[model samples]
Target: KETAAAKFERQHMDSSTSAASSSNYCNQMMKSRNLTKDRCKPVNTFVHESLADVQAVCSQKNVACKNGQTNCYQSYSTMSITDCRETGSSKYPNCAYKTTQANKHIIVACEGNPYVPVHFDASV
Candidate 1:
């Protein structure tokens, strides 16, 4: 079964290299990561940091998730991340994406005993 953590890692974590990267990043990553599971995901965020650093966020400030769940947490540290968004010309199967990177405080929803990020709520 694909646990929330597994899915989270697959879709969001990228500790291998750094930066939002070349325009080609989104094209290759969105496809390689299977973001286009069936249809092109309109938007997604990739955090380029060690999993340990990201998991630590769960133990930080407890905040409200976008959906209003209080299980969300805000990380005190800013992280390097890339935002991938589908372009108007992009369609399912050929999912083209616009890549943007930035360093910002992150918000994520957490759950389970070894609480970890399950949903990226926002960045500010």
Candidate 2:
């Protein structure tokens, strides 16, 4: 089974690339990364930073989760990330997305013994 930390890495971490230059980045990545299997994910963000750096965010300032949970934390530093939003006309199995890259403080939900990030709440 895939662990929450592993899934978070798959969906959000992309240390190799700092910028999403191609418009097709979301289109290609969303599918290639297996986020487009059963249905299209409406919105997702890829962090362009080391896994260690991302995990360190769990020690940052506490914040309210998007779902109102109290386990969320906001990063102290602005980090490079790519936001992938589904297009208006996008259909399932043919998911199209708009990719935009920026540097922002990301909010994420943490869990477990080590308290690593489990869900990406939002970027501010």
Q: Which candidate wins on TM-score? A: 2
Tell me each candidate's RMSD, in Å, in order.
Answer: 0.9, 0.8
| Every model's TM-score | 0.96, 0.97
User: What does candidate 2's lDDT look like per residue over 1-124, in tens digits?
Assistant: 9999999999998898978858888999999899999999999999998999999999999999979889999999999999999999999999999999899999999999899999999999
Residue by residue across 53-87, what tens digits does model 1's lDDT show?
99999999888988977999888989999999999
Model 1 residue 55 lDDT score: 95
List the candidate 2 regions with Cα displacement exceeding 4 Å: none
lDDT of each: 0.89, 0.94
Error of 1 at 21 (Å): 2.7
